[PDB]
Ligand binder design. Sequence first.
Ligand SMILES: [Zn+2]
Ligand SMILES: [Zn+2]
Lengths: 261, 62, 148, 50, 240, 149, 115, 82, 64
Amino acid sequence: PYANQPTVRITELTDENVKFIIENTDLAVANSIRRVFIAEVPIIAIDWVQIDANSSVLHDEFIAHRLGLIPLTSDDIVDKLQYSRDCTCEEFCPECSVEFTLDVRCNEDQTRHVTSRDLISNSPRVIPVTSRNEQDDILIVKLRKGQELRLRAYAKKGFGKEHAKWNPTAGVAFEYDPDNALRHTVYPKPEEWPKSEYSELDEDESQAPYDPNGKPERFYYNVESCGSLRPETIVLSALSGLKKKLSDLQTQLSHEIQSDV
Amino acid sequence: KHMVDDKIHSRARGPIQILNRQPMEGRSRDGGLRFGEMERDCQIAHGAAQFLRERLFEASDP
Amino acid sequence: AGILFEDIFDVKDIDPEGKKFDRVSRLHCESESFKMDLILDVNIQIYPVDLGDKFRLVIASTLYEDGTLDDGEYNPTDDRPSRADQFEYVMYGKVYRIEGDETSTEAATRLSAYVSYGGLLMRLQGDANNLHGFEVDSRVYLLMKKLA
Amino acid sequence: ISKVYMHLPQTDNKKKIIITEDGEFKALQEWILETDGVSLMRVLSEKDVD
Amino acid sequence: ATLKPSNKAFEKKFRFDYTNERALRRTLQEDLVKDVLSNAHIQNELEREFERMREDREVLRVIFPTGDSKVVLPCNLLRMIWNAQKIFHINPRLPSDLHPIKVVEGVKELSKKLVIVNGDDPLSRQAQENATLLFNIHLRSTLCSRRMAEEFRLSGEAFDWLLGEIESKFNQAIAHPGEMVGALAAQSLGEPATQMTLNAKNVTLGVPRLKELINISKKPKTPSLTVFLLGQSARDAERA
Amino acid sequence: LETRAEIQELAMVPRMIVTPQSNRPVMGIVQDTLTAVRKFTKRDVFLERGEVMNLLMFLSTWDGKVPQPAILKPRPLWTGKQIFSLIIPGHINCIRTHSTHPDDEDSGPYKHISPGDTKVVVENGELIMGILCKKSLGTSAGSLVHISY
Amino acid sequence: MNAPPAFESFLLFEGEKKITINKDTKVPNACLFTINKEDHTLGNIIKSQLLKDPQVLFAGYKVPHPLEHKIIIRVQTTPDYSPQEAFTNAITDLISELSLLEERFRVAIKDKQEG
Amino acid sequence: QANQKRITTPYMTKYERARVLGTRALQIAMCAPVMVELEGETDPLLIAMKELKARKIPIIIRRYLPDGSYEDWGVDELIISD
Amino acid sequence: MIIPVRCFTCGKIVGNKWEAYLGLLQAEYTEGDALDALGLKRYCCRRMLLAHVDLIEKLLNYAP
Ligand SMILES: [Zn+2]
Ligand SMILES: [Zn+2]
C-alpha cells in the first residue's frame, strides 16, 4: 500500500550515452521514465525564423525546418528559461528565448558550406553542439558564387510532444528480463534467437526456466543523448519533470476534492 | 501524389449551373456530389421517400 | 460443508491425442476409493503435473468451510476461513452437461458430469451414487492438491 | 441435337430420390443423358424416356 | 424433423406412448401420469395429434421430394426452447409438470393466433392454412407432446412463455406494408453478380447465363436437355 | 427533422446489420479483431489481474463486477473465454464449429469435451467452450452476431 | 487544412478543467477520474501504483481516443476506504519513489564520475 | 370504409413509425403542445420518441388500400414493436 | 536533396557525417567500415548515410 525502494547501478557513463540499471521498481514506472526521456524533457531549439534573403536552391521552409533540428547546448540554461506561453513579455525576450543570426554570401568560386558554425547566438551558453569545444559541423545548405542566405532565428524551450526537434535522445535502449524467465515473449524456436548483451546464461542454453512468482525487475537502459543535454542531465531532468507533473496533478486533485463542498 | 487535401470536398448552398439550377461539378467550382440513380434505387429500397425527395428536389433544385 | 465430491486420483496418461496447446494439458486420471474415471485440463505452466502423480480432488460448491453460498465475484479482501488454503490448485467453473446410461424406463446407474472452468474442461464419470450434488448451470470449484 | 453425353450423376440433385418401403429416402444412381440441342416436344415423346 | 426419419423411427420418436407407465413415471409427475393412464379422451387427442403429424409428414414428402430438410422459417424453435430451458432453470433429469394435453391445446391456439391472412371466409381460411402450413408443420413437429416430455422437458411456465415468444417473434417477422420488395430483389440479385465469374460438357455460368435468363434469348450459347430414363435403360448402359 | 428521424429509424447501421438478401448479417468481425479473437479464446490464454482490469475498462456493457477467475491458486488468472463471456450480451445460446473441427469427433467420444477446443458452445451468455472464428463471428448465418440481432 | 496544433495535446484550453471526478453508480465505492491533456505516461504509473494497494479492488486506465489527449482512470475500493484517497496516496507514493530514485541516481553519477 | 372491420395489420410499420416520429418532431420544433412529461428532453426527436413509448401521440395514420378505400388507424390503436 | 539533420527513426545527428563519410570513401574505405568509424551502429542511421543521394551538388551546377 506504499511505494518501492528502487536502486541504480550505472555500468557506463560518457559524454554521448549513459548505461544504467534500475531494480526493485514496477514496469510502469520504468516505461514512463523511458517515455519522459523522449517526450517530456525540456530542451532549447529553434522555433522562429525570419528569412531576410535566400538565393539558395532550397526554399525558405526547407531552411527553417532544417535549422529547428540543430541541437543547442541547454545543460544549465533550460532550467532558467521560461515558456513563451507563461512569459509576460512579447516578441522574443531574453528570458524566454535565445536570438540567433546568420549572414553568409558566396563570393568565391568554391562552393560555400553554410554550417552550424555560422549560427551566431547572443548567449554564449546556448550554442550549437558541434560548435562546442573530432566531430564536424552540421551542414545547413551549400551555396554557389553569388548566392546569399541571411536570417534571424530565435530558439525556444520545448519538449518532444510538441516537436521531435525538442527530443534530447538519439535512442533509448530499454530492456528488461534478458533471459525470458517471465515468458512475456514465446519464441517458437528459442535456439534460433541470439543472446542479449545483459544475458547471464551458458551458450548450451537458450532461455531461463519459467518463473511463476516472477515480476518485472532489473530494467536496463542506454540513454544516447543528441549532444544538447549530457546523458545524466536527461535522466535527472526526466525524473524531476515526471515528479512535477504528479505534484501538479495532486494539486488539481486536492482542488477538486475540496471544490466538492 | 494522391493526398487528402487535394480530395477533401464539402458544399452547402454554393454556386449552381446556368442551364439547370443545380449544383456545379468539381471541387474547383465548389460543385456538389452526384446523387446518382444507384443511390435513388438504394433509398427506394429503404422506403425513405422523404430523404429521396429532399435530395432530389429540396437539396438540388427547388 | 459444501462439498459435492472428494476422492484421490492417479494420473494414468497425459495428452494421449497429442499436445494441442502449450500452457494447458489434458490429464486422464482414475481413482481408487470410488473408481471414477477423470479427464481434466490444467495449466501445467504454473502447476506442472507428471505421469503417475497422485492428487486429491474436492469438487465443492463454495470455498467457505461453513455452509455459505458465494457471490461469484472476485474479492481478494476476504479474511473468512477458506478451504483453498489447504490446497494448491483451485479452479472455478460451471456444470454444463450431465450424461448417463439411463434408458426410457430404467434410472441412471452411471453418470458423466462435465464442468467448464472458463474453457478448461473437466469430465468426471462413474457411478451415480457419487454424483448426486452435480446439477447443470451450477458454480463449483476444483480444490486439487498433489500428494506423495 | 448435335451430340448427347451419357453419364452417372455423382450429385443427388440429378439422382432419383425414392421412398423405400421403410419410409427412408434413397438416392438411386441412374444413367441420364445431356444433349447439345433442345427439342422437348420430340424427345419427351419417346419410349423409355421419363 | 419429420421429413427424413423412417416410419419406425418417426413412430418411436413422435408417437406419445401412454401405455408404458414406467417411462411416464420417469418423464411426468404423479398427478399427470395417473391422468394420462386413466383418461381416454386425452389418449384420443394424442392419437389424433400423431395422425395429424403423419398427414403433415406426407405433405412434406410431396413438397420436398429430395432429402433436404434444411428450410428457412421465421422463428427458430430449437433456440427458443433452449432459451426457455435456461430462463426457467429446467432440469432434464427430473420429471416435468407439463401436461401433454396443455401442449396440444397450446399449439392449436397458437396456430390460430398466427394470421398471415385476415378473414373467416373459406377462401381466406384456405389461404391462411396454406401460408402458415410449413411453419405449422415445423411447429407441431417440434412442439410435439412426446418431444416436450422426453427431450426438452419444459414446465408449464416455460411453455406459456414459449408460446408468447413464438407469437411475438412471428408477428415481428411479417412483411411490413410499403416495403419496396421490388428494388430490394433487384439489388439482392445484382449484388452477387459482381462477385461471380463470367466463365462432361461445357455449360454457360455466371453473368452470361444470368444475362440470357433476364433477357430471354432465342439463341442461347449452350442450350441443353436433361433426359431421364424410365425403366431398365436407367440401370444398364446398352439400352441407354 | 422528418428526414433525420426517418434515417434514424430506417437506415441506421444497427438496423442494417442483417440483410434480407441472404437472411444473415453483412457486417461481422474483421482482420485484426478476428485473428486476435481466435488467439484470445484459445484454451491456453491466461490473464493476470492487471491485464484483466485493462481489458474490462474497454467494456461499455459491464456491470462493474469482476468475475471470479477460472484459476484462484497458486496465482489468480482469468481466461480469454471468461472475459468474452462478459462481452457477449444477455443470455443468448449458440452452437458452432471451429474451422479445424475434425469430422471424426462428433461421432466418437469426447464430443462434448473437445480436445482441440472446437465445438463453440455459448450458454446463458457465457462462452462455455470453443475457439471463435469467422464461422462463429463472421458474416455467416446463425453466428453469435446474427443470434444477438 | 486540419492539422491540430501540437501544443493542443499538453496545454489546457481556457476554462477546461485538468481533472474531473465522477462517482460510478453501477457499483459502490467506485469513481472515474477524467484527466485532460495527459496520456499513458501517467495512466500506467498510477494504475500500477493503485494495484499494489490491497484496499483497491479495481484500478485501470484508458484513452477514449488516441487523437484526443484525455484519459479516464477507474478506481474501486473497499467500503472502509475511498477511491479519491487511493488516487491521492498513489500520487504521493509515486512522488516519494521518484524523489528517492533521483537521489540514488545523483549518488550513482557522483560515484561513477569520481570513480 | 367501415371502421368496425379494418383488415390491415394491428402493428405499426417501420415506415409509419419513421413518419410519425418525423412529423411529431417537426410539430414540437414549431412549439406545439407536448402531451407527456419533459424531465430533461428538448431535442424534438427524443420528445417524440418518449411520446411514442408512452403512446400519447395525437396523430391518425390513413392507410390507403389498393381498391381506393382507406382505414384511419390512430397511433394509440397500433401496437408498437420496436 | 541534401543530407538530413537527424535520423528519422532515432534522432541521431547525421548532418555532420556526410562530408566525413565521403572523406572516408575516397580514402579507400568500405561503406561498412566508414559507417563504423563514424559511430553509426544502428541500421537506421546507417540507412541514412548509405541510402542518401546528394542532389544539391547537381542543383549548384545551374547559375543562380
Ligand atoms: Zn519572454
Ligand atoms: Zn538512427
